[PDB]
Ligand binder design. Structure first.
Ligand SMILES: [Cl-]
Ligand SMILES: [Cl-]
Ligand SMILES: [Cl-]
Length: 129
């Protein structure tokens, strides 16, 4: 599924991400835009042999099992395929574990480089929330 900006903001709000660990909804929408272009089916292979999955590009070395990442920790206890669903529940539940892990949203390279310290409220401007 390719989400619209306001559609995704509404879905993320219903799943409890607005101000989760102090990160306003715009931070999450900005992260999804630059990680996946709002596409739930996005995948990207890394040099270390791990793969990033879904709307928030969650990595197979630590967070999900894809059966081809040796030494996989599978901390969200989910097959990586579950993160590619039109239903973002699995991605949101796993993201809540990641953002609690100590480094907050710096875990997402695209958030640190393209969202952090910008006017992230712009990402939810015009939306009925
Ligand atoms: Cl915001
Ligand atoms: Cl959803
Ligand atoms: Cl933090």
């Amino acid at each position: 599924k390719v989400f619209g900006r306001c559609e995704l903001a509404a879905a993320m709000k219903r799943h409890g991400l607005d101000n989760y660990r102090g990160y306003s909804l715009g931070n999450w929408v900005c992260a999804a835009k630059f990680e996946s272009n709002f596409n739930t089916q996005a995948t990207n292979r890394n040099t270390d042999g791990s793969t990033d999955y879904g709307i928030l590009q969650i990595n197979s070395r630590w967070w999900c099992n894809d059966g081809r990442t040796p030494g996989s920790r599978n901390l969200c206890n989910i097959p990586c395929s579950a993160l590619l669903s039109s239903d973002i529940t699995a991605s949101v539940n796993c993201a809540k574990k990641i953002v609690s892990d100590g480094n907050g949203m710096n875990a997402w390279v695209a958030w640190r480089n393209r969202c952090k310290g910008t006017d992230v409220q712009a990402w939810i401007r015009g939306c009925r929330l």
